[PDB]
């Protein structure tokens, strides 16, 4: 429900071996078709969340009316093959004066690893959080995920700051067993962060908005 347990799955060639460019486009999951495709990517990376739990987590955005709120899943698609390259699922929270985002799911797909798409998607999330009204991105980080989030600049949330939202967090946020709570404040995100992450993704050009839309 709001508790989980990260169980990761354990010869893999690069699908970007060609000269490029490889055109790619970001998308928001808005159809059952995209929902199925993102769940398929996740299901090859996770043992738990299992198939039912991925279907509970990856959903169409709320049919509501004024700030961003609720669940959103974005993906990056490789246009040559229509394959999903990576995907993130968030929950957007507005609690009293606290406006923040949590990230239950994040993965890069088979054949696309170690190309910079993880850094790129994280950069696109932080840029979206800045542009919408969010103050920070909060991560429930299983022991196996801490080094990754840490490398990308998330830090262990200080206890005094967690205690300010601890009640709302324990009752509303998606908590992985044994996790550490990590955080990046959006005021620390550089304006050129997406530009620099994309520059590092070799042989890729992005068509459409270079970032996440809602």
Ligand X SMILES: CC(=O)SCCNC(=O)CCNC(=O)[C@H](O)C(C)(C)COP(=O)(O)OP(=O)(O)OC[C@H]1O[C@@H](n2cnc3c(N)ncnc32)[C@H](O)[C@@H]1OP(=O)(O)O
Binding residues for acetyl-CoA: 106, 108, 113-114, 116, 118-119, 151, 200
Binding status of residue 79 toward ligand X by CB under 6 A: no
First to last CA, the chain: 25
d(CA 140, CA 173): 9
Candidates 21, 147, 178, 190; binder of ligand X (CB under 6 A) is: 147
Residue 4 lies near ligand X (rule: CB under 6 A): no
Tell me the closest approach of the beta carbon of residue 13 to ligand X, in angstroms. Answer: 14
Check if the beta carbon of residue 184 is closer than 8 Å to that of residue 136.
yes
* 116 touches ligand X (CB under 6 A): yes
How does DSSP classify residue 188? G
Choice between 99 and 119, CB closer to ligand X: 119
Q: How far is the CB of 94 from ligand X (least distance, A)?
A: 22
CB of 206 to ligand X, least distance (A): 15
Does 92 participate in binding ligand X (rule CB under 6 A)?
no
Position 13 contacts ligand X (CB under 6 A): no
By CB neighbour count within 10 A (0-12 exposed, 13-18 middle, 19+ buried), where does 208 fall?
exposed
Is the separation of the CB atoms in 102 and 174 below 8 Å? Answer: yes
CA angle 40, 91, 194 (to 5 degrees): 80
Per CB under 6 A, 66 contacts ligand X: no
Alpha carbon distance 200, 109 (integer Å)? 18
- Total residues interacting with ligand X, rule: CB under 6 A: 19
- Specify the residue for token string 């601890």: 166
Q: Residues at the annotated binding site? A: 106, 108, 113-114, 116, 118-119, 151, 200
Is residue 115 at the binding interface for ligand X, with CB under 6 A as the rule? yes
Class of residue 70 by CB neighbours under 10 A (exposed 0-12, middle 13-18, buried 19+) = middle
CB nearer ligand X, residue 151 or residue 155: 151
Residues near ligand X, by CB under 6 A: 6, 8, 45, 103, 105-108, 113-119, 145, 147-148, 151
């Amino acid at each position: 429900l709001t508790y989980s347990q990260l169980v990761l799955r354990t010869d893999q060639y690069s699908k970007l071996s060609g000269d490029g460019p490889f055109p790619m486009a970001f998308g928001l999951v808005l159809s059952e078709e995209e929902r199925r495709e993102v769940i398929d990517l996740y299901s090859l990376q996770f043992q738990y969340p299992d198939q039912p739990e991925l279907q509970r987590l990856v959903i169409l955005p709320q049919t509501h009316s004024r700030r961003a709120k609720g669940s959103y899943t974005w993906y990056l698609r490789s246009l040559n093959t229509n394959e999903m390259v990576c995907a993130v699922t968030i929950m957007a929270h507005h609690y009293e004066t606290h406006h923040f985002v949590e990230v239950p799911l994040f993965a890069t797909g088979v054949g696309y690893k170690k190309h910079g798409f993880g850094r790129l998607m994280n950069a696109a999330l932080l840029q979206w959080c800045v542009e919408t009204g969010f103050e920070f991105v909060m991560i429930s980080a299983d022991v196996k995920a801490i080094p990754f989030w840490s490398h990308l600049g998330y830090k262990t949330m200080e206890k005094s700051e967690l205690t300010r939202i601890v009640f709302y967090y324990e009752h509303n946020c998606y908590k992985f067993k044994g996790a550490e709570v990590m955080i990046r404040y959006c005021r620390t995100w550089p304006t050129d962060g997406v530009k620099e992450a994309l520059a590092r993704v070799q042989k890729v050009i992005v068509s459409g908005h270079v970032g996440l839309m809602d």
